[PDB]
Write an enzyme that holds these catalytic residues in place. Structure first.
Site, mmCIF file in Angstrom:
data_model
loop_
_atom_site.group_PDB
_atom_site.id
_atom_site.type_symbol
_atom_site.label_atom_id
_atom_site.label_comp_id
_atom_site.label_asym_id
_atom_site.label_seq_id
_atom_site.Cartn_x
_atom_site.Cartn_y
_atom_site.Cartn_z
ATOM 1 N N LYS A 259 -36.751 -51.029 38.385
ATOM 2 C CA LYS A 259 -36.891 -50.658 39.795
ATOM 3 C C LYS A 259 -38.339 -50.706 40.258
ATOM 4 C CE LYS A 259 -32.749 -47.829 40.181
ATOM 5 N NZ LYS A 259 -32.283 -47.700 38.773
ATOM 6 N N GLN B 182 -23.880 -45.213 40.674
ATOM 7 C CA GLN B 182 -23.316 -46.520 40.391
ATOM 8 C C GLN B 182 -22.313 -46.927 41.462
ATOM 9 O OE1 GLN B 182 -24.691 -47.996 37.952
ATOM 10 N NE2 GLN B 182 -25.235 -46.455 36.388
ATOM 11 N N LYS C 192 -41.782 -43.917 35.325
ATOM 12 C CA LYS C 192 -40.390 -44.312 35.517
ATOM 13 C C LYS C 192 -39.694 -44.368 34.169
ATOM 14 C CE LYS C 192 -36.860 -45.439 38.064
ATOM 15 N NZ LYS C 192 -35.950 -44.729 37.098
ATOM 16 N N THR C 193 -38.504 -43.758 34.100
ATOM 17 C CA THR C 193 -37.590 -43.837 32.971
ATOM 18 C C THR C 193 -36.596 -44.982 33.182
ATOM 19 O OG1 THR C 193 -36.142 -42.240 34.063
ATOM 20 C CG2 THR C 193 -37.692 -41.369 32.520
ATOM 21 N N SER D 74 -32.891 -46.832 31.024
ATOM 22 C CA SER D 74 -32.003 -46.890 29.872
ATOM 23 C C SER D 74 -30.932 -47.944 30.114
ATOM 24 C CB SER D 74 -31.340 -45.533 29.588
ATOM 25 O OG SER D 74 -32.302 -44.486 29.509
ATOM 26 N N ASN E 197 -30.823 -45.672 23.117
ATOM 27 C CA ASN E 197 -30.871 -44.848 24.330
ATOM 28 C C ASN E 197 -30.934 -43.394 23.892
ATOM 29 O OD1 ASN E 197 -30.509 -43.480 26.777
ATOM 30 N ND2 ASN E 197 -28.520 -44.423 27.223
#
Ligand SMILES: *C(=O)N1C[C@H](NOS(=O)(=O)O)CC[C@H]1C(N)=O
Length: 354
Positions: A60, A113, A307-308, A310, A335
């Site tokens: 992102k 989602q 920022k994370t 997974s 993860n």
């Protein structure tokens, strides 16, 4: 190097059975690479800073840079209504949502989602055309792949280009990221790690609607650190520098976290407790009323940007403080808990800041 990378990373790899990790740090203008374990458990092939990991939602930040770039180039303005840039959204709820709200998850409760039934471009358009806001625009933050996904899609098409084209042919080359991919090419499969699920099977990314925009980049620690480098005093192209500056602009805040384009940031110094809270499901899972800014705010260099990300088998984290010239990238093929990523990165960054 003031940091003790091995001493912080190696106990974490053991505690969560992480098969491989590429760590890259920046300090005083030099990159340092620390590589651990294996990219592929059956062959034993070792991780390097050229191993390709799925970085998930860290994508992102690149999508946000692309959207900011399109805005600087005149494709749209951040306060434009979304339907100004999608004729198929005219008359929908997106008449009343801005491009900035879309990019910052504040359109009004778009979900994390897409519903499972959305599996085509046509069904995607129908989904947005029939979407019913949960909240008034700009008042609540709900982290959302559909939200920034649509932002990236429409930003690219505002220059007449598909997202993948603008990313692969313009943004990544201009950033100097030559081994960073939406889809890994044949010439690079030898470098593509396998991920390992929380149930422990070898797994790789599931393609999905707007996956490229929201969570679909593959790259290594060297390329990802180079992108972080551009976020810390980028010397170069005016349009790209202005784009990066827009990603360091704050649009609202939730607690101690300020939401930028892609990047989320904190005052620096930041405590471990504050950084953990900002990256916890109390922020990332539920819709929160935001502290509103009458005008977007250039946030400044003395801040922790992070920022994370997974995927099914991967876990990534990036954090940097531009004023200190310090950064950490951690790419793993498990993860594993966000809290462990944050605790390790905060410990190493605290040392790099000495
Ligand atoms: C990003 O990798 N994702 C979006 C969301 N997780 O947000 S986080 O990455 O900021 O923790 C759901 C999981 C993941 C994804 N692939 O959708």
């Amino acid at each position: 190097l003031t940091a003790t990378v091995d001493g912080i990373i190696q106990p974490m790899l053991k505690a969560y059975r992480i098969p491989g990790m590429a760590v890259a740090v920046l300090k005083d203008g030099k990159a340092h690479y620390f590589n651990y374990g294996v990219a592929n458990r059956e062959s034993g092939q070792r991780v390097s800073e050229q191993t390709l990991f799925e970085i998930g939602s860290v994508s992102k930040t690149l999508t946000a840079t692309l959207g900011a770039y399109a805005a600087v180039k005149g494709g749209f303005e951040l306060d434009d209504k979304v339907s100004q840039h999608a004729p198929w959204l005219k008359g929908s709820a997106f008449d009343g949502v801005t491009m900035a709200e879309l990019a910052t998850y504040s359109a009004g409760g778009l979900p994390l989602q897409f519903p499972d039934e959305v599996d085509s471009n046509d069904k995607m358009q129908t989904y947005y055309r029939s979407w019913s806001p949960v909240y008034p625009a700009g008042t609540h933050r709900q982290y959302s792949n559909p939200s920034i996904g649509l932002f990236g899609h429409l930003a690219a098409n505002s220059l007449g280009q598909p997202f993948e084209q603008l990313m692969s042919q313009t943004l990544l080359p201009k950033l100097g990221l030559h081994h960073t991919y939406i889809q890994v090419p044949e010439s690079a499969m030898a470098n593509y790690a396998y991920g390992y699920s929380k149930e422990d099977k070898p797994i790789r990314a599931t393609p999905g609607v707007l996956a490229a925009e929201a969570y679909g980049i593959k790259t290594g620690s060297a390329d990802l650190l180079k992108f972080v480098e551009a976020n810390m005093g980028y010397q170069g192209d005016a349009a790209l520098k202005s784009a990066i500056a827009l990603t360091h602009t704050g649009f609202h805040s939730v607690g101690e976290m300020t939401q930028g384009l892609g990047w989320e940031s904190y005052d620096y110094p930041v405590t471990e407790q504050v950084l953990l809270a900002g990256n916890s499901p109390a922020v990332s899972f539920q819709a929160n009323p935001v502290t509103r800014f009458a005008v977007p705010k250039a946030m400044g260099e003395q801040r922790l940007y992070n920022k994370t990300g997974s995927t099914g088998g991967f876990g990534a984290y990036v954090a940097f403080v531009p004023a200190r010239g310090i950064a950490i990238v951690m790419l793993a093929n498990r993860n594993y808990p966000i809290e462990a990523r944050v605790k390790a990165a905060h410990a190493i960054l605290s040392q790099l800041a000495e």
